[PDB]
A paper describes a structure:
However, exceptionally high-level aminoglycoside-resistance is achieved by the action of intrinsic and acquired 16S ribosomal RNA ([name]) methyltransferase enzymes in aminoglycoside-producing and human pathogenic bacteria, respectively.
The G38 backbone carbonyl forms a hydrogen bond with the SAH amino group, which is additionally positioned by two conserved residues, via hydrogen bonding interaction with the L110 backbone carbonyl group and a water-mediated interaction with the side chain of D36. The hydroxyl groups of the SAH ribose moiety form two hydrogen bonds with the highly conserved aspartic acid residue, D61, while the adenine base is bound in a hydrophobic pocket formed by residues L116, I93 and P62, and additionally positioned by a hydrogen bond between the adenine N6 and the side chain of CacKam residue E94.
Numbering used by the authors: 9 to 230
Write the structure that this text describes.
Amino acid sequence: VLAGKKLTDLDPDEWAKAQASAERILVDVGTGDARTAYRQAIAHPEWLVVGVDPAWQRMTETAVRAARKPAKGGAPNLVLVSSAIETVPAALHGVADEVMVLMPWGKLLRGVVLGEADVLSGLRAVAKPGAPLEISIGTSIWREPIPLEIRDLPELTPETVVSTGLTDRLAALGWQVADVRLVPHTDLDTISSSWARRLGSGATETVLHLRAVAVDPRDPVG
Ligand SMILES: Nc1ncnc2c1ncn2[C@@H]1O[C@H](CSCC[C@H](N)C(=O)O)[C@@H](O)[C@H]1O
């Protein structure tokens, strides 16, 4: 089930032919209005870009522009799926060569910070063996006013990630942590994109980057 301005069923046969013709498959979890996923599709035509988000109405503006003709900015290799990651359909299982969570909010953000099974399993479910997971979080959300979904949780830092046992929880659910770091002055354009913000603005923010590799699950501490 996905979008073409309207909300329709996707032909399973069209799904296999698209994946097979793709040089690479990239799944973005939590795309907002999916301008980020759209820019990537344009920048890489040979990639099959898959944006997944429960708020499907939020990504209709992108769905319209991507539905246009190549001469007017159409992106045929863009697939915007209406779904939550904890209940991702079986058609998206193990199809991604790369999974990215960029500037998450709500259930996805809280699930990542806490290391909840439902979210982490869903993220792992869509990835192929060896696929990289890229989580990027702006650290300004731990400055008042702090969003409701995280205002009862201490700030997530490179040190906190291992102390709270997030490293071992990720590894147990199939994500082997490769790198955790803060990258200050990260240009917000390179991770975040909505049709409300113009490019080349120059807005920066300290970003918590978390990189992992899809491995076999059930791998806990002793
Ligand atoms: N459990 C969940 N699974 C998948 N997506 C979720 C989710 N909980 C929240 N989201 C989505 O994640 C989105 C974050 S807004 C971020 C948009 C984009 N990454 C950008 O930087 O521009 C929200 O629109 C919300 O709909």
